[PDB]
Amino acid sequence: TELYNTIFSETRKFTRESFKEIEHLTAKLANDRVARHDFLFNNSIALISDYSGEDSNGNQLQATVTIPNEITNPKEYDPSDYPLAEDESFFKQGHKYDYLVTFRAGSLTNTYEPKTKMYKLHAALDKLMHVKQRKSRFADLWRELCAVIASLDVWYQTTNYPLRTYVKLLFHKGDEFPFYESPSQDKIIFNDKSVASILPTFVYTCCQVGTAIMSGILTHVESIVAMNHFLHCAKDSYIDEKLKIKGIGRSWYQEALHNVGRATVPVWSQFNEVIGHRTKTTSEPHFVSSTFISLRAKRAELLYPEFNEYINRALRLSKTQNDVANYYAACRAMTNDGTFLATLTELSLDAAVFPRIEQRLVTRPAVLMSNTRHESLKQKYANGVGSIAQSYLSSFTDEIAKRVNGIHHDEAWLNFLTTSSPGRKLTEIEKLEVGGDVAAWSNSRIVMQAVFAREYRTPERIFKSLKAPIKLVERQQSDRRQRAISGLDNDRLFLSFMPYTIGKQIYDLNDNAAQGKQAGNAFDIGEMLYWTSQRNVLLSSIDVAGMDASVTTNTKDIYNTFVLDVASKCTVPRFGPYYAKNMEVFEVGKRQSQVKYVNAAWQACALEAANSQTSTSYESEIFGQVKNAEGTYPSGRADTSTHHTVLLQGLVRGNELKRASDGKNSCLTTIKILGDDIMEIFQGNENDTHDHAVSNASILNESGFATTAELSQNSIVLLQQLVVNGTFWGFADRISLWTREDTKDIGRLNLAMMELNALIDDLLFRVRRPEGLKMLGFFCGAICLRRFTLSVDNKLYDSTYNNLSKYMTLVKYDKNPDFDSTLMSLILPLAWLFMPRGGEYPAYPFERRDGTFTEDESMFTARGAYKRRLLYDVSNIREMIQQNSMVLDDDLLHEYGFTGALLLIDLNILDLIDEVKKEDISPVKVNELATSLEQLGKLGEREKSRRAASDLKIRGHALSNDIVYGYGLQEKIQKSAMATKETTVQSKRVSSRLHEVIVAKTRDYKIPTMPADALHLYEFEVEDVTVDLLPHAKHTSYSNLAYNMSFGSDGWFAFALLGGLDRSANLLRLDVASIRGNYHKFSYDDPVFKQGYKIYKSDATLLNDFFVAISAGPKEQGILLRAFAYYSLYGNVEYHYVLSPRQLFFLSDNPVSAERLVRIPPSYYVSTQCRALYNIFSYLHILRSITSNQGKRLGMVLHPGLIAYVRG
Amino acid sequence: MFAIDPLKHSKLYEEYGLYLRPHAPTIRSIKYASLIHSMLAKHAARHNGTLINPRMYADMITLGNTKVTVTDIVTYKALTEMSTLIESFRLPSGLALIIFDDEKYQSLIPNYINQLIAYTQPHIIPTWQGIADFSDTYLRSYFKRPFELTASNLAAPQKYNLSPMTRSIFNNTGREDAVIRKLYGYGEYVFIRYEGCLITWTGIYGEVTMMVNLSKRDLGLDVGDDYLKEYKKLLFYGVITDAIPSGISARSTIMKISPHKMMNPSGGALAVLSKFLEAVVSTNVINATLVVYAEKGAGKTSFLSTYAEQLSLASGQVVGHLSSDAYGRWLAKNKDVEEPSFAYDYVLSLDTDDNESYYEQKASELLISHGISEVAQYELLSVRKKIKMMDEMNEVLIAQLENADTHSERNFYYMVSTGKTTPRTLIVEGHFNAQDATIARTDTTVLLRTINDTTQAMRDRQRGGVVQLFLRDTYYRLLPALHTTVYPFEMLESIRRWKWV
Questions:
Q1: By the 8 A CB rule, do A638 and A417 touch?
Q2: Where, by residue number, does GTP 1 bind (chain B) (predicted)?
């Protein structure tokens, strides 16, 4: 009846009497909204006001549920909250609010005549209040709130916790919900006009606070403190007040860790290993303790005093480093909301992209050589910050020019368009006409390049592009402003391509950039983990506030000098429309004009540097066309990250050289830069490190930037990853399980489970209790993703319903008199969540026939084809190998409903969704566009591939066109081009072709078994021998290096059993990854390898034609021949598991690390690929079941059919 | 083989001073190149304006070493047709692709020739002042070679070995073409026709050459005339072809005037100016503004006033024009009033010459603090000594651009641009590129150059010329050429080329 009284809520296992009950109740929550209003607003829940309990570190705390009068009694709409200028050309200059002010939802009245400025303004404010607030990831917002509340009820087994009283006091207005959303109108329709305007965001706020409670980050009293602070921020304007105190509520942790005094922390090696632990001091130097006064005063005058009192409580009652970590994660949950921050871009445009000047003006380099238009070709700095950056950068120009000379730049431009263009899109579908006739409607850059390919070599294309405006497109991300990003056409993108190509080469010449390390695991933070285990070290996470708005035109000239130096030194003809030639030129000192030989790249770079226009133009519904002031940096450009990286590394390393030439030492060890993120590490005395850090700050101030100097002894930040004393403090409130950037229907819903599993795996080491997060994901799959509606034919209605209702539960409609083919509602069973190609979600214990249970699958269990082993684990696999059978117990698999899920994934019913239909161009036009596009760089590679593909075709071995290299560009143009500007939505239904297999596959439907899934039949017996732990198990028992890896936890014990991750410990690499995945990159389930192995088993004279048609190089040719040779011998067994680097973050990627834990009898080693296969068996079993692992040694037993399958 | 066919586009070559020799192996070669141009246009019209193998076409035409012969046929049909055409020429080598080094020539090259340039070493002919040198092999072999008549050269054509079928005539005698044609026996010859002028002046550092887009009759100047005589026509239509600083001054006289080819405007300049004119015309834009940067001393207000008048006449709208010292002459009056006025007529009334600027007062006090009072004192310093003072001038400049207060410059241009009675289209002048964050929101900012040695115009004037030269050098140190460079005749040609109504 109720979810906190089921037998699953008390046992957390699935019997046959408990799984059907959860299936029924989650179906009742997923189907109708009357039951959702009944569940969220039951009468039996008493409203609590005062409350008592523990904090995140176990100390008693008392809070009171408080809701201000401005939320229950909202003010009326004030039109001076969004003022205009006198001309009414744009909003007013200093305007207080950029986001949705809180008011009564019916108070906003568009009483103006149409085609008026006030009419446009109030229509846009209606769009702000009704459209910009619906941000839901999986389902409607009330279903997501039902998922959070259901998870909390089943976990805590009671219904009296304060978030229920918050939900009832904020959202119970009558006998219906106060608002709802419709995907047909794409807006939030209000039912109660008396409710507040910001009130539909608090459903998502309550979802995030419940996620934080499920995480173990917030307790219930801390959830009271969090919700009181969010309503206090919503008292006037919620997003503005959140952004105003976003840093004050976080930056106290340095003072807290100072007052801790001593910490026993782990010690990291150079080679990614925990080698010991030390006991260090955590007191701070005196220039850090001077900032504490300003932070205390600003904290006392700015923050809500309940949250301020919680922060002072965290300052006092912390004794370890883990105490400060727990209170810091609590304050991250208390200040961040999870929702993506979004309003009208006219409101955030003046704060995201408007240029600004800070500290001082940047002057110019002396122009040494000059064009006849007096435009600069060569220049040099007299003295100042340009001279300091160039003193370091000018030593790289000759090597970079040597590297640039060996690149074909036309093929590089075409590869840049096909792969990783910076805006990724033209932001809108545009009309494509050349000779007075339109060609296509498209938004891809490669179809745009294929259309205007006749003028790729024409110089007037560049000047034609200088006439076009630079487009503006907005962004969402949580805990951050709206961040308008620019978009520009292919020719303005082409002007910035050679500066990008030049500045890209310096990454291969230094070690002071961070591009090489984004792998999703603990290799990304290894240098911080090393340098924070050191002593006499000063850490500096120096932050430049608003860098793209701070780069002026003269600041761009600093990088332009470096680009012009490299461009003058190189020898590159034929870049674009440009070609190397003698050119009339001016020089300083020379009164007349000289003649110099100028190559193509230096022409392109000089013409780009001399014709600079940044200002983005936005097309507004209120004001028409809005332009920006100039002197920003466009950031939808080719060289956007490389510019800031090169400039910052030049300023820092040139300041090191400048201090050397002034007679001062350097204490700088490493720097890491990725554009607007600098990470400086100094080592030495406090005097020298303070002097060098102050000099770097002053030389950034001299370059025209404003800097906030957060510099510490024991904490470092880079790329939103915080390391404190050899320990990773993850940021769990940067991942939103509930909101999105864009509103988008799901349709496929296997993709929805893949997205949910990826987000759950991203929240895995940055969380404190992963088991409640597993329950939360189970309920958001059981409520949010459980509904499917499909249109079914009228004559075919009853025979479809009666056949499908034997295995599933289906909701049917009465009639359809007015139209044909009414739609049928079917809800999928909960067994679909745990299936191969279904949900692939970790499962709870299922009961066998004997009363034994399967294993509670942990957060480290593999996905992919390894989920099929649960079908055999439920079938009592130990009993099934002790009487030598392979019979799946289809009766028990039917009573849990696995066979309906497998019938559903077999019949492909969940593919029949609505589909946006594009109206394509003629295929003769497609061939013409691709043939014209091939003539732009590296002639002759694709027509040879087409010739060899036709040669394979005539000998009777046809290749598919998505594998042939001469094709595919045809396929890309065919996908992304249209002959019209509008698209239609086509729905799908069941017809006789699908009804025939509905009738055929639903008579008995035994679950099929292949001959190859005998490899699942293996088990592990527990011996009384206790394994030894790794020696770093004692070094991580003090001050855990993740929030889930505390002493005693399963992540800690998995690290203590399997060890850490290593890049050089590849014991078996070919034989493991062969039966798991690929050979090196070519997986066996690729059409490339499959068609190649077909032509390999056939005559070998056609093989070289296969190599020419794929057009692979000779090294890949040899690798792929060895791939066929390794598949032909010992390629029959294969196992296909899937893990993730965010999932196995600190843990090892190697299955060989489990061979010390499991005793395998030597009579099973009957093939050369048994060893790695059994290592994978042991490794996946040990990761799958860490929760019941008490440190005993395992013994593996195998099935005789498994031995017979591995022998042959 | 030229990039542009002379047998078809003969008038474009007549513009350059090049006349076809009348109708030998060169005579056969130019017809062969015409046939190749026609065949290339036919093959390019069938596949999206492109050629299917431009390296193959380039080898067949320029090297002449490739025969494609049918012994797919569909993929190589055009190459077989081009092969049978080039094979029948029976040339000992190929036809080299020939390009002039002019921008007006390069804009008129067809697309398929541009596709062939990337796979060919072309023969590039340099241009001195927009005129290709007539001593090249191809220009001597295909065209008539010009002969210049001057005041000392002048005689009957029988005195030299001149003939109508070989030479063309450049009349530089200062006399009428009819008088030379009937009085000295040049009746059967063809005269080359130029529409502009080239003037050589006397300079401070030497002599200065100036190209002017007016005729010698319209520009009423003779040898010996002063620089200030007919100054405004020179300013509106002239470009100095020398390095900066070119020592032109008010004391310059004319050494020589000859007829010369007219300059063609740049493509990027006309592009940015037509972007501004599109903003002026369109009804979707509420306010349109052109920011024009120039060096202090260029005479930019005198041009931009006439530019604003011509834009009002060709457009039909009211054009506002703030000077470059507008905020300075405002702040020299209103830096103490708590709520000062921002009305356009008041600020426009403060733009007169007899109002002192705020930055001029601060720079004059800064010069007095170093004992500088004279131009001879200021010129006698070293470069480091000057830069040490310009850093202090940048410190007094940064206080007015750093924030948005009521007397800030950003708020000044905000409250002028978004006023009630201010005109829709504004033209605002600036001194340096750091005002891009401060002048009102535009999409078109250009940089202006004139015929003015700015450091010579500043030392040849009164009312605190030391402060004027100091501010010129400070603003030069803050203003590179990082926006598109536009001359005055280009800004007039932009208005003349825009189709109105």
A1: no
A2: 296-297, 300-301, 461-463
